[PDB]
Amino acid sequence: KDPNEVRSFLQDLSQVLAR
Amino acid sequence: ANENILKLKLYRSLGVILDLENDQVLINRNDGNIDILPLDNNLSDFYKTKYIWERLGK
Amino acid sequence: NDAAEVALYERLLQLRVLPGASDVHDVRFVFGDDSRCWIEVAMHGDHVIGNSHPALDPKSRATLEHVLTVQGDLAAFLVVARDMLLASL
Questions:
Q1: CB environment A1-19: b (16+ within 10 A), e (fewer)
Q2: Would you call B57 and C83 a contact, using CB atoms and an 8 Å cutoff?
Q3: Which of C5, C8, C19, C63 pairs as cysteine with A17 (C-beta 3.0–4.6 A)?
């Protein structure tokens, strides 16, 4: 429950899913 | 670099914990308690899905 | 086994995590057995709430954006987004 964490998590997930 | 590692991080963060050693699902709760749904029964996929989502929000 | 766990979570929640259709920065959350509704999100700064099916009103979209950027709660975002998409179908 932190916006910086959700931001980096969703950045990480979109990167892995796009690859 | 599996997308399954991050997907499981997401699924666990919902408060849904798989406990297949006991053929059950642990649902973290409204009241701040633990709901446990068995999987070794005749429960339909539809009912189990409804049961889980109803216990994740207010 | 991670892939088997994923398959089980997908079946229990009827929630599937997919690549964005339009862009590389989007994550598409698909809800339902038939994949009847979905919502895309991005954290690249161009926008937060992307496209969805059904499309949502501005107030619903502003609530969802707030749950992600103000409360920073990914779980609560999925619960609210799911409710909104199912209610608007």
A1: eeeeebbebbebbbebbee
A2: yes
A3: C19
CATH architecture observed for domain B1-58: 2-Layer Sandwich (3.30)
End-to-end Cα spacing for chain A: 27
What is the resolution in angstroms?
Answer: 2.0
Cβ of B6 and A9 within 8 Å? yes
Nearest-CA distance C89 → chain A (Å): 26
Token pair for residue B13?
A: 């963060």
In angstroms, the CA B55 to CA B31 distance is: 10
Rounded Cα distance between C82 and C15, Å, is 9
With an 8 Å Cβ cutoff, are A16 and B10 in contact? no
